[PDB]
Amino acid sequence: SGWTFGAGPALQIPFPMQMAYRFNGIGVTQNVLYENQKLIANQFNSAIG
Amino acid sequence: PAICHDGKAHFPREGVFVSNGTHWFVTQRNFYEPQIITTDNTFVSGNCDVVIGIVNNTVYDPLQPE
Ligand SMILES: *[C@@H]1O[C@H](CO)[C@@H](O[C@@H]2O[C@H](CO)[C@@H](O)[C@H](O)[C@H]2NC(C)=O)[C@H](O)[C@H]1NC(C)=O
Ligand SMILES: *[C@@H]1O[C@H](CO)[C@@H](O)[C@H](O)[C@H]1NC(C)=O
Ligand SMILES: *[C@@H]1O[C@H](CO)[C@@H](O)[C@H](O)[C@H]1NC(C)=O
């Protein structure tokens, strides 16, 4: 649900969209994630591993 | 995540893409305030071959009719 459950009722949202908006929060547009999603997913998985 | 008007991706400027199941709208994050998807409300980035989940739809040209 992203951060929506920290304010009121929990609102569903696909994780790629949530991550794109977390990028948009730091000043990088949505297109970066939607064009490198495989790379971000692999990097995050490797970091968690 | 994006719209593919003519073989070319389209991303929301500030909002999300939603739909009634027949028509596609661009709206805010906290309210369902639908607006017709126009080129002034979306920015082009990509070539409609890397984004996953992208739907075709159409956008509205505000200059072609006149
Ligand atoms: C990433 O997810 C995959 C599955 O979605 C995990 O794959 C299995 O993980 C278990 C748990 O260690 C292993 O016993 C299996 O051998 C894995 N199968 C394959 C085909 O890899 C994978 O472990 C996840 N990544 C991490 C770092 O846990
Ligand atoms: C969704 O919006 C469209 C706008 O063109 C409207 O015609 C339709 O009745 C609405 N609802 C559904 C279920 O499509
Ligand atoms: C969008 O239209 C093109 C042109 O016919 C087609 O090749 C493509 O498969 C369509 N995309 C989707 C998601 O239907």
Q: Alpha helix (H) ranges present in chain B? A: none
Residue type, B4: C
Contacts 24+ apart (CB under 8 A), B13-20: B13/B41, B13/B42, B13/B43, B15/B41, B16/A17
Please state the three-class secondary structure of A1-49 as a single string: CCCHHHCCCCCCCCHHHHHHHHHHHCCCCHHHHHHHHHHHHHHHHHHHC
Cα distances (angstroms) measured from residue B19 to each of B3, B30, B55, B63: 12, 15, 11, 25
Query: Is residue A21 a contact partner of residue A33, using CB atoms and an 8 Å limit?
Result: no
User: Which residues, at least 6 apart from B58, have a Cβ–Cβ distance to it below 8 Å?
Assistant: B5, B37
Name every chain B residue with its beta carbon within 8 A of the beta carbon of A21: 29
For chain A, which residues lie within 8 Å of any Cβ of chain B, measuring from their own Cβ? 14, 16-17, 20-21, 29-31, 34-35, 37
> Using a CB cutoff of 8 Å and minimum separation of 24, what contacts does A20-29 make?
A20/B1, A21/B29, A29/B11, A29/B43, A29/B45
Alpha carbon of B46 to ligand 2 centroid (Å): 29
Residue A10 near residue A4 (C-beta atoms within 8 A): yes
Solved how?
cryo-EM
CA gap B62, A23 in Å, rounded: 30
**Structure tokens given for A21:** 């908006």
> Resolution in A for the shown PDB structure?
3.3
